[PDB]
Every structure is written in structure tokens, then in C-alpha cells.
Design a protein around this nucleic acid. Structure first.
Length: 47
DNA sequence: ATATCTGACACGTGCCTGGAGACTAGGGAGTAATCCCCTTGGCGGTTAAAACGCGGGGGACAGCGCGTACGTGCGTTTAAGCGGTGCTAGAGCTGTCTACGACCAATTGAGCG
């Protein structure tokens, strides 16, 4: 139930969420990339 | 001589600028009906137009004198850097209310009697 963070090379910003659909699907996982208002706006959801 | 530096020189992704495709549906383009308009054009009370006889004053001097110019004195002017550090815009985010949408009433313009 803790907060955690992953940093990765950009071409791996896909398997890093797909793994959390099969190994254990229970996690609250948030991707973060895109145009400024694609990405930054997700910080207004978790606050 | 040597450590290691400053290009060489490239593909990493960010940002936004900037283009073209397929859709709705806003609105532009095509049109009569018909009115009512810009326009043509005679009418006579009123002022543009130019002399003669004339009044108001434009015009050219002489020189007095209340102000105007130079350009240096001298003490008062802003310059000037660079200490601290509050202001200031960025900017991240609400937390609504305020102006702008959706449904339908008082008051108006059109018809002719």
C-alpha cells in the first residue's frame, strides 16, 4: 500500500504497465508521459 | 610527456507550429415580389456676381528702450557600483459566480380600413 516510482528508457513505457496486468493485476499503477496537458493533468487526479 | 580538454556531427525526445482530412450544420448564394428610391427636371423668393463713390485703415519710417542674447563662475546636480533583500510572475489550483447558453413571456411592426 506504499507510494513507489519507476524510471525507464522511453521504448519500455508499455511492458512496465502490461506486467501489472498478469504477474499481479491488483496494483494502482499510473503511467506518466505525453504533451504537457496529457501528462501534468494526472497530478490533479492523485492529489 | 602527460592528464584531459573542446570539438564533431551525430540521434535522444521535449516543445509548438503548422497541414490536410471527413464530419456536421451554419450560412452563404440564388431568386421573386414589390416597393420605394435615386434620380430627372420646372419653379421664381432669394442671394452670388461685379461697378461707383467712398470709409476704415494698410503701409514705411525714425529711434526709444524692457528684454534679449553669450558663455564662464562655483557650488550644487546626478552619476556610479554593488551591498542587502522585498517585490514580483510563475504557476499550480482551486472554488465557485459570473457571463453566456436554453425555454418562453410584454411589446413592437405590419395590414388597411
Amino acid at each position: 500500500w506504499g507510494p513507489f516510482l519507476i524510471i525507464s528508457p522511453a521504448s519500455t513505457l508499455n511492458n512496465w504497465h502490461q506486467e501489472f496486468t498478469r504477474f499481479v493485476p491488483k496494483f494502482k499503477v499510473l503511467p506518466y508521459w505525453g504533451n504537457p496537458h496529457d501528462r501534468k493533468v494526472i497530478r490533479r487526479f492523485w492529489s
